Amino acid sequence: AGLVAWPLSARGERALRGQAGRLADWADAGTGLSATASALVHRRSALEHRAVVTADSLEGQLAALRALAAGEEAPGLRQGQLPATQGRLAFLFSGQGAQRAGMGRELYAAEPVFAAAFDEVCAAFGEDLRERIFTARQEELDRTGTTQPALFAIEVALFRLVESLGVRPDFVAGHSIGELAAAHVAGVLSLPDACRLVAARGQLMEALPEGGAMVSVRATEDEVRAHLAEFTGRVDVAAVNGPESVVLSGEEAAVEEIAGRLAEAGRKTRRLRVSHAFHSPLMEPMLDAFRRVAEELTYQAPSVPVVSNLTGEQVTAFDAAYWVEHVRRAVRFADGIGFLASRGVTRFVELGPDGVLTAMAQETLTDPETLLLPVLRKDRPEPEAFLDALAQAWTRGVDVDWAARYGPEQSTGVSLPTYAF
Amino acid sequence: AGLVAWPLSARGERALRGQAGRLADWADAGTGLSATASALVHRRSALEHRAVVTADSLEGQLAALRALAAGEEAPGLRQGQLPATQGRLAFLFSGQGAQRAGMGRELYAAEPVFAAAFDEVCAAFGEDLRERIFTARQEELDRTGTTQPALFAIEVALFRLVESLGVRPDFVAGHSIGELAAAHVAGVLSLPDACRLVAARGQLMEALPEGGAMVSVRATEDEVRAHLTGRVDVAAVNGPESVVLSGEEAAVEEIAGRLAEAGRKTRRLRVSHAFHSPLMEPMLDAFRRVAEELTYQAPSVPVVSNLTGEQVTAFDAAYWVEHVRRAVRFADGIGFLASRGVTRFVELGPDGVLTAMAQETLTDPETLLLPVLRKDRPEPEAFLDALAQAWTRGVDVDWAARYGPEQSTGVSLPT
């Protein structure tokens, strides 16, 4: 005869004891043992309501608290409610075009874990990278030999920051350069190997010549691929970011011609502001030197599952060959998202300078229940944006280890009324 | 101007809103922003009381509940209270010692995650190990060529089971062979590399000749190294008081009588060979040969070393060879774990012998030391009771992974 456990919890002992008495009274006439076990665990999660009030003064905290009491909305108040069943959590690492001049500088000054990991990553690269990223003009930042190290540095620093706050992903994924960050952070590459890989990836493409274009098209992959027959080796699909969101890449003239035919057929196209035709045949000339670098490195099994841009499903095996193809072939981002939802991921946290990947993922997900969060936003200062993303996440059930930010030593002496609960 | 967040939680919206209004009333007269953030985190945690009633019938469940209601104790009832600061959690993996014939079989039949991982590990050794371990007589078990793969298989299976229920360690540690299971599980070895290493470790030392003894002693490490040539060594430093010597039978007997003459207790161990002694030296060259063929990764989770009694981040063939030869500094490792804020120690093994050893080092009531399996109890009951007790003291168990949501549909709990 199988034993069944009924787990009860309450605030204070008398309430625990009362709950037990009532549960027994209710159960006296009969219930399923294991049915009642489930009910006890899922009722408890679904009942929990949460809020966070955030301000830089007591006056501000008080106002947001009063608003919550009265059932009002307010700036600095986030609130929500856990689901019965808690879903899995993925980090999404940003790609090209995300970078903005001065990114990271506010967070650096305010968040010592982020600062320390950022310094460490930049030191690994050498070349006075941290200052260049903080100091550099936009044009300098958008040089892809600088861009890819910078994005990698920021994204890995952000990962350590959120990891220090106890937020642990069940999956990681990235877009283009973002994948290299996700790999490093899942333990596939040592930092020195990772920097060597990223440094060469950027530097080798920056040397490629001009005349490449990229155009985003609002159509299906099949619709776009129809047009590529007559333009092999000149144009390719660079990305499939959504069910109707695909990016064409290659020699300018060819790309223009294809784009124009798709626009004649009623489909909207948008030329991207980029230096090179990424993920296209125009990348071919650097690939031999890139393999040479990647072949010198050591590749481990990932500690956390990594979603592949190549396949749109899980990678288990990383090698020099993978990273070379990665550079060349289409980024199957939308398939990646679909894969993550299939594995029960309902929380998506974007690590990177903005919310670009979050909006792309929404093209696939489209559900109010699921949560997609950028950790930084162009709209607000970085410290504020980060702290609000933590608040919002926690409010919807993401485990955040607030104690790591607000240590027990600071509470010593505070007498918080018990009925404060 | 730094932003500060105050996180509030409650049961239902009405209560959350009421708690907010009372917190503001309290705070109006002044209070440190970040101080109040900490207090909110920690005091909320400190308050939570938990219990678990476990039985195989309704009658049992009801009685245990009525006992809880009245404040009494009862079979099937566990109960406790979270601490303010949730301490860190370590897994302790058992060394050869209390392996028992038929170990794992009950758990195999009742827990599919444990079954699948056990099958997988045994298949990786091959050679009908899975049939061997359940089937085997105690003496068969005791042959280290058998013992070490078996223990490794059981301990890795238990880890996957505990992991499937959401219990995740911040550190792992092992005694002797236990360290190999801990290393594999922290991702240092592939499974095929791991079984190859443990298969060889066991077989090579089974083939060593008779004539080795081990004795455990009730006295400090310093006191024992005094009464030490190259015939006998320290095999382990389990507790501040307790240590183990190992080596040539005659020499060991000699050092033992001599410490017994000084009024301190000694205990002859029932072992096949003199582990972690000079008597291991003849296998070490062949063992290095096997180890040097393998690939060693950086650990995903911090691993505590038997060699040093602190963390290791570097594993190679050389490490494992020295590991075999030199003393197991278990007590130091336990001390190291406490130093890092570990307050929850769960032993993954056939029996809870390790928990007792650790207990030597740690005497606080607040610290929790739990074996997951118990001799004298059915394994499924033992495993369930360890879960219940752990959760009750704040270890985060994912109960939903055992009792899924689909079974709750239709049940209306009392409000």
- The answer to whether B269 contacts chain A (CB < 8 Å) is no
Instruction: Give how far Cα B124 sits from Cα of A44, B118, B196, B316, Å.
Output: 41, 10, 9, 21
Sign for the CA dihedral angle at B58, B63, B69, B75 comes to: negative
Closest Cα of chain B to A143: distance in Å? 34
The answer to whether B263 contacts chain A (CB < 8 Å) is no
Least CB–CB distance from B6: residue in A7, A53, A410: A53
Pairwise CB contact (< 8 Å): B68 & A403: no
CB pairs under 8 A between A and B: 295
Which residues on adjacent β-strands are paired with residue A81?
A49
CB contact under 8 A, A68 and B17: yes
Best interface-test mutation with B: which of A65, A79, A190, A412 has the largest number of B CBs within 10 A? A65
Method: X-ray
User: Closest residue of A to B71, CA-based?
Assistant: A17
What angle separates helix A191-207 from helix A287-294, to the nearest 10 degrees? 170
A266 touches B at CB < 8 Å? no
* B229 interfacial to chain A (CB closer than 8 Å): no
Assess B391–A contact: CB distance below 8 Å, yes or no.
yes
A39, A61, A416: residue with CB nearest B413: A39
Contact A179, A93 (CB under 8 A): yes
| Largest CA-CA distance found in chain B, in angstroms, rounded | 79
Orientation angle between helical segments B317-325 and B191-206, nearest 10 degrees: 30
Mind telling me how many Å the CA of B320 is from chain A's nearest CA?
A: 20
Contacts of B413 in chain A (CB under 8 A): 23, 26, 36, 39-40, 43
Quoted resolution (Å): 2.2
Report CB contact under 8 Å: A61, B388.
no
Domains of chain B by residue range: 13-86, 88-208+276-395, 212-268
Query: Tokens for A114?
Result: 């982020």
Listed by number, the residues of chain A in 188-207 with a beta carbon closer than 8 Å to a beta carbon of chain B are 190
**Domain A212-271 has what CATH class?**
alpha beta
Question: CB distance from B35 to chain A under 8 Å?
Answer: yes
Q: How far is A106 from chain B (nearest CA, A)?
A: 12
Calculate the alpha carbon distances from B145 to A116, B104, B152, B207 in Å. 48, 18, 12, 9
Q: Which helix (H) or strand (E) holds B153?
A: helix B144-164
Strand, helix or coil for residue B175: coil
Query: Which CATH fold topology does A88-208+280-402 show?
Result: Malonyl-Coenzyme A Acyl Carrier Protein; domain 2 (3.40.366)
* Chain A residues closer than 8 Å to B395 by CB: none
CA atoms within 13 A on the CB side of A12: 7
CA distance A397 to chain B (A): 11
Collect all residues of chain B within an 8 Å Cβ-Cβ radius of residue A51: 7-9, 16, 20
Domain spanning B88-208+276-395 has what CATH number? 3.40.366.10
What span, in angstroms and rounded, lies between the C-alpha atoms of B167 and B284?
A: 36
Give the closest-approach CA distance of B7 to chain A in angstroms: 4
Per-residue buried b or exposed e for B267-293, using 16+ beta carbons within 10 Å of the residue's own CB: eeeebbbbbbbbbbeebbeebbebbee
Contacts of B11 in chain A (CB under 8 A): 47-49
Shared fold status for B88-208+276-395 and B212-268: no
Q: Return the ∠ at Cα A124 (arms to A119 and A129), rounded to 5°.
A: 60
Contact B187 A41 (CB under 8 A): no
DSSP sequence for B272-308: SS--SSGGGGGGHHHHHHHHTTS--PPPSS-EE-TTT
Contact criterion met (CB below 8 Å) for B124 and B157: no
CATH value of B212-268 in 3.30.70.250, 3.40.50.300, 3.20.20.70, 3.30.465.10: 3.30.70.250
308-367 of A, contacting B, C-beta below 8 A: none
Q: Cα distance from A354 to chain B (closest Cα, Å)? A: 20
C-alpha closest to that of A289 among A234, A212, A207, A233: A207
Collapsing DSSP to helix, strand or coil, B187 comes out as coil
**Spatial separation of the C-alpha atoms in residues A403 and B2, rounded to whole Å:** 17
Q: Would you call B407 and A38 a contact, using CB atoms and an 8 Å cutoff?
A: yes
Considering only CB atoms, B5 lies closest to which of A26, A52, A416, namely A52
Question: B98 to chain A nearest CA, in Å?
Answer: 26
Of all residues in chain A, the one with the smallest CA distance to B58 is: A33
Helix (H) or strand (E) holding A51: strand A48-55
Query: A22 and B110: CB-CB below 8 Å?
Result: no
Token pair in block for residue B94: 């058992």
Cβ pair A7:B52 closer than 8 A: yes
The minimum CA-CA distance between A272 and chain B, rounded to whole Å, is 37
First to last CA, chain B: 45
**The tokens of B331 are what?**
């007590």
- Angstrom CA distances, A175 to A219, A241, A307, stand at 20, 9, 10
Neighbouring residues of B405: CB distance < 8 A, sequence distance ≥ 6: A38, A42, A84, A85
CB atoms within 10 A of CB A375: 27
**What is the CA angle B168-B117-A302, rounded to 5?**
55
Question: How far apart are the C-alpha atoms of A269 and A5, rounded to whole Å?
Answer: 59
Give the list of residues 6+ apart from residue A294 with CB closer than 8 angstroms, or none.
A197, A200, A319, A320, A321, A323, A324
User: Smallest CA–CA separation between A23 and chain B, in Å?
Assistant: 7
Sheet with A171-174, strands from edge to edge, namely A314-315, A306-307, A171-174, A88-93, A345-351, A371-374
Contact residues on chain B for A166, CB-CB shorter than 8 A = none
Partner-chain residue, chosen from B7, B16, B27, that has the shortest CB–CB distance to A58: B27
Query: Chain A: residue nearest B21 by CA?
Result: A69
The residue among B77, B414, B402, B63 whose CA lies nearest residue A41 is B402
For the sheet with A212-217, list strands across it. Answer: A235-242, A245-251, A212-217, A269-271
> Is the distance from CB of A403 to CB of B38 less than 8 angstroms?
yes
* Strands A345-351 and A235-242, bridge-based pairing: unpaired
Q: Could you tell me which of B170, B155, B166 has the C-alpha nearest to residue B302? A: B170
Chain A residue with Cα closest to B37:
A406
The label of the residue with tokens 């469940």 reads: B61
The shortest C-alpha distance from A186 to chain B (Å) reads 9
Angle between helices B191-206 and B144-164 (to 10 degrees): 150
Q: Which of A9, A23, A61 sits opposite B65 (nearest CB)?
A: A23
Is the Cβ pair B26, A391 closer than 8 Å? no
DSSP label of A298: -
Q: CA B236, CA A226: separation in Å to the nearest integer? A: 71
A4 touches chain B (CB under 8 A): yes
DSSP string, B97-131: S---TTTTHHHHHH-HHHHHHHHHHHHHH-TTHHH
Q: Tokens in use for A306?
A: 């990594």
Write the CB contacts of B347 (distance below 8 Å, at least 6 apart in sequence). B91, B92, B93, B94, B353, B354, B355, B358, B369, B370, B371, B372
Q: Under a CB-based contact definition with an 8 Å cutoff, are residues B232 and B327 in contact?
A: no
Chain B positions in Cβ-Cβ contact with residue A12 (cut-off 8 Å): 47, 49
CA-based angle A419:B3:B8, to the nearest 5? 25
Residues sharing a CB contact under 8 Å with residue B314, sequence separation 6 or more, in sequence order: none
Residues in chain A closer than 8 A to B31 (CB atoms): 58, 414
Say whether residue B50 is in contact with chain A using an 8 A CB cutoff: yes
> HSE of B250 in the Cβ direction (CA atoms, 13 Å)?
1
Q: Which of B67, B40, B37 is nearest to B52 (CA)?
A: B67
Interface test with A, best of B36, B48, B61 (most A CBs within 10 A): B61
CA dihedral B80, B334, B165, A185 (to 10 degrees): 130
